[PDB]
């Protein structure tokens, strides 16, 4: 990828922008509205939200007050754990549309696997897909197991798997499984919620390039072929974060970053989050 | 208790109405606002919401629109999982106050224990309690061990433990432990989210008494000395639900209902939901 507009093709030929804005822990109304606006105005073409983020309304208002045609925009949201099941997901989806002021979503993800209800929730996604309400359907926080089990009974293969991904948790096993299945990986907490931006191995590599630690990580994502969705509520970081198409990491750098892995999570394990 | 006004004394001498409005899955603004003031217009003096419900603004609005004195109302909210940690709990609590339009909460709860972050989530509750911004502090979906564990380092013991409780799930053990610890049990999902309203055994007992199953269940919560907070978005259900003070269940009835128990949940198990 050479710019912000750049796209990855999903197994159904839907072009998902390689880069995005996540809006988790961002507050409803103006914070979310302004962040969405600032990102779009600076060229982001991809927003990632969730029902549980509480901010679909402010995101939906950013989109509109943004000034870019809806169809040039790729909007994602997720069904929450509590609405899992066939009928309750259908209904959960429509509430997301209505808060978002959208007629369709570009991606809709199951938030978490959990225990029992995700196969029926998938059936619900598939139907919305067929009804033409969602352009792409996918999954979030799924292990190779869940995916194996999903696939027994799926009519549509998931297009995206959005998992926590960063130097500290590099997802080697799931990456190989997912690329072999034409399921695109997407990185959540790509910045490890900020916890890596003092990392000395990363700061030496940022130094060399004249870049921030956040940029390096973000470029590392791109060179591994993982869609990314960093979050910020500060406009200069939103710009700082997209400013990565003017340098590359060498194989040398890439492996060093990879040598940071502790298989280490700052958010829930999908195998421990059971409802 | 003999009326809607009736209260239980928590171990710090705070008086919590036995009966409340639960507001889970009720929509922000008009729906919330209207639910609340229909309840208050009919004598309810306790409302239970949470940060993660995201009707806290419509609740606060309905509180003020009802016209009743702050001091006569009992408002409960909860710190969500995503925001546990000492600093984030203080912050998350100021957010609940702000959008509730309250100066203090009557009760603030740890929503779920999870895995790691509850003990110092608690330190944050305690601090706010000493700053006199919360009249009572407590906990939700804690098991005997979470509580043993909390108590090893607490300066203040939980005054309320809010857990899922209904004939399918009669929380026998946990009730003995809280009773002995001076920790007030409170029932969430009291009607099992509507699942039992059609139960055969509760039906013959309702019929005999000239009440609905929902009332029978509700009277059963009280005769067990559990605070209860049924949810309805329908003003007639709200009124019905509180109309439980003019009849009583015998020892036969109580034991019959009790015998329903299947250790059966409609919501997550606290021991499984591991964030
Ligand atoms: N599918 C799922 O279950 C999950 C999905 N996600 C998705 O992933 C997205 C991003 O992950 P997220 O958890 O938000 O965290 P990130 O890893 O992207 O990091 C965000 C934190 O780092 C800071 N930060 C961002 N940019 C910079 C910068 N360049 N320099 C210094 N600090 C910076 C931010 O502060 P500040 O805002 O002040 O700038 C913020 O506090 C979420 O918004 C969400 O959409 C996240 C968790 C789970
Ligand atoms: N701490 C925690 O994790 C949790 C806390 N809670 C709290 O407890 C409260 C209880 O709500 P919840 O537990 O979800 O639901 P309940 O067990 O109170 O029952 C809610 C369901 O019963 C329905 N209902 C159907 N018929 C009747 C009737 N005949 N009379 C009265 N109600 C009827 C309501 O429909 P309708 O509204 O359309 O009338 C709704 O679908 C919550 O609202 C929340 O405050 C809930 C869950 C977890």
């Amino acid at each position: 990828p050479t710019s912000l507009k750049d796209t990855v093709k999903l197994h159904n030929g839907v072009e998902m922008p390689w880069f995005g804005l996540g809006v988790f822990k961002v507050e409803n109304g103006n914070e979310a509205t302004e962040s969405v606006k600032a990102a779009i105005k600076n060229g982001y073409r991809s927003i990632d939200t969730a029902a549980i983020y509480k901010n679909e309304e402010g995101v939906g208002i950013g989109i509109k007050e943004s000034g870019v045609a809806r169809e040039e925009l790729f909007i994602t949201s997720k069904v929450w754990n509590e609405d899992q099941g066939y009928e309750t997901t259908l209904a959960a989806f429509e509430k997301s549309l209505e808060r978002l002021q959208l007629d369709y979503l570009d991606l809709y993800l199951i938030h978490w696997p959990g225990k029992d209800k995700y196969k029926d929730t998938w059936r619900a996604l598939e139907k919305l897909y067929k009804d033409g309400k969602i352009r792409a359907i996918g999954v979030s926080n799924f292990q190779v197991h869940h995916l194996e089990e999903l696939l027994k009974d799926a009519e549509i293969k998931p297009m995206v798997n959005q998992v926590e991904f960063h130097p500290r948790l590099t997802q080697k096993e799931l990456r190989d499984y997912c690329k072999g299945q034409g399921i695109q990986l997407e990185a959540w907490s790509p910045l490890m919620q900020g916890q890596l931006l003092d990392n000395e191995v990363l700061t030496q590599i940022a130094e060399k390039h004249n870049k921030s630690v956040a940029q390096v990580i973000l470029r590392w994502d791109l060179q591994h072929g993982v869609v990314t969705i960093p979050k910020s509520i500060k406009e200069h970081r939103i710009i700082e974060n997209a400013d990565i198409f003017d340098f590359e990491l060498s194989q040398e750098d890439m492996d060093k970053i990879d040598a940071l892995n502790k298989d280490e999570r700052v958010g829930p394990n999908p195998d421990e989050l059971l409802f």
Side-chain angles (χ1 to χ4, degrees), chain A residues 193-220:
Chain A
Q193 324 212 342
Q195 293 181 37
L196 268 171
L197 310 181
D198 266 19
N199 180 276
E200 18 208 344
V201 169
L202 281 158
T203 108
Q204 113 253 138
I205 286 158
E207 286 178 354
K208 202 221 300 211
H209 291 292
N210 270 234
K211 290 312 204 146
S212 75
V213 168
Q215 288 164 327
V216 169
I217 298 168
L218 262 15
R219 194 62 206 199
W220 180 76

Side-chain angles (χ1 to χ4, degrees), chain A residues 126-164:
Chain A
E126 298 185 306
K127 166 253 212 294
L128 299 160
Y129 188 89
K130 255 165 266 129
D131 287 6
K133 295 205 169 126
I134 324 163
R135 290 175 70 229
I137 59 172
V139 116
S140 184
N141 303 295
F142 264 53
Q143 301 284 55
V144 170
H145 90 93
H146 301 281
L147 294 164
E148 300 167 334
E149 178 73 45
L150 205 82
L151 292 164
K152 297 186 193 319
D153 283 288
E155 296 201 322
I156 305 158
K157 173 174 288 202
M159 278 138 212
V160 177
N161 190 195
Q162 181 181 132
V163 307
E164 175 177 343

Side-chain angles (χ1 to χ4, degrees), chain A residues 197-247:
Chain A
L197 310 181
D198 266 19
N199 180 276
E200 18 208 344
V201 169
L202 281 158
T203 108
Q204 113 253 138
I205 286 158
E207 286 178 354
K208 202 221 300 211
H209 291 292
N210 270 234
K211 290 312 204 146
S212 75
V213 168
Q215 288 164 327
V216 169
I217 298 168
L218 262 15
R219 194 62 206 199
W220 180 76
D221 291 340
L222 291 194
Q223 301 190 210
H224 276 312
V226 190
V227 177
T228 192
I229 36 154
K231 166 274 203 220
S232 189
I233 249 52
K234 319 181 154 52
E235 153 163 50
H236 74 94
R237 320 231 260 211
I238 284 147
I239 303 167
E240 201 213 284
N241 292 349
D243 190 19
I244 63 172
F245 312 101
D246 78 338
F247 77 123

